[PDB]
Amino acid sequence: MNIFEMLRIDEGLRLKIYKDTEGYYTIGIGHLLTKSPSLNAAKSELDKAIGRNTNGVITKDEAEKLFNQDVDAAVRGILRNAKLKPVFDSLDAVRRAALINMVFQMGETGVAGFTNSLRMLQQKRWDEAAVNLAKSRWYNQTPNRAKRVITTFRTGTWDAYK
């Protein structure tokens, strides 16, 4: 298991524009196109992201290309963020993947706001961090995925993705 396979499990693969769990136009492996309610705006973002007139449909290779860019961007966001970087650097590789997963789903600024959870992770108080992470809109709106990510933080294993 690795961050790419973990996110493929959590995000799926769809080759036509679809609405994500929040109702926002998305394609591929959880590539958010826009929060605009305009499908035309989403189609314009997609063509810009892919570099051709897609008419709302992409190939698997194209979806994987955006996915690799999006994972890269999530990691970059962590490393440039004054609050996320020290936590990330303190973690082992498995728990690092859990943090990348959160940033992929909610964004750098969103995860950086989890001040008390981040502190508990920095302190390696894993059960306490897991309890705190679940007191969140994130957990309530996507509980099955949040449970997998939280288990990964709690145990430092891939058990929840087996």
UniProtKB/Swiss-Prot annotation:
Protein name as catalogued: Endolysin
GO MF annotation terms: lysozyme activity
Entry keyword set: Antimicrobial, Bacteriolytic enzyme, Cytolysis, Glycosidase, Host cell lysis by virus, Host cytoplasm, Hydrolase, Viral release from host cell
Active site: 11, 20
Binding residue positions for substrate: 32, 104, 117, 132
Effect of mutating residue 117 to I: 500-fold decrease in enzymatic activity
Entries under SUPFAM superfamilies matching the protein: Lysozyme-like
GO biological process annotation, one example: defense response to bacterium
UniProt effect for mutating residue 11 to Q: Complete loss of activity
EC nos: 3.2.1.17
Gene: E
Pfam families assigned: Phage_lysozyme (PF00959)
Cross-referenced InterPro entries: Endolysin_T4_type, Glyco_hydro_24, Lysozyme-like_dom_sf, Lysozyme_dom_sf, Phage_lysozyme-like, T4-type_lysozyme
